[PDB]
């Protein structure tokens, strides 16, 4: 159950059907994308572009509240 | 239920506790950080930098699958 802090980049484009009630709300946007881009079907999404990267890095770059969490799962 | 489609323009930097044993699938890697991004709990997670863009296209630039999608909906 090793853990580590990962430092990660998402550039995604794409086109979408959706409905346009669910694209009005600032604070919903990027989750009405993601459920989105987690349903990936063909017939509503085509992706463009992708670039994903995970690096892990040192924990000292974590935040305060991810440090403390760190030491939770390691103990 | 209007539907329009959408180009869209996600990109997001963030640092992330994972297990390790996660993040080594290059098939499943991106659900697994779309999966961390959805829960957002800051005990794990710390969004450094993010731009979300959606624009409403018109049709033509849809897939094909997806312009039939688009008739299927609207009929």
Do not use: W
């Not at 919903?28 to 670039?51: K, P, R």
């Not at 924990?59 to 760190?70: I, T, V, Y």
């Amino acid at each position: 159950l090793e853990v580590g802090v990962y430092e990660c980049e998402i550039h995604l484009k794409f086109r979408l059907i959706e409905e346009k009630s669910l694209l009005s709300d600032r604070e919903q946007l990027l989750q009405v994308l993601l459920d989105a881009l987690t349903e990936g079907s063909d017939d509503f999404l085509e992706t463009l572009q992708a670039s994903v990267k995970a690096q892990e890095v040192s924990e000292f770059k974590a935040s305060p509240q991810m440090r403390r969490q760190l030491m939770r799962l390691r103990n």
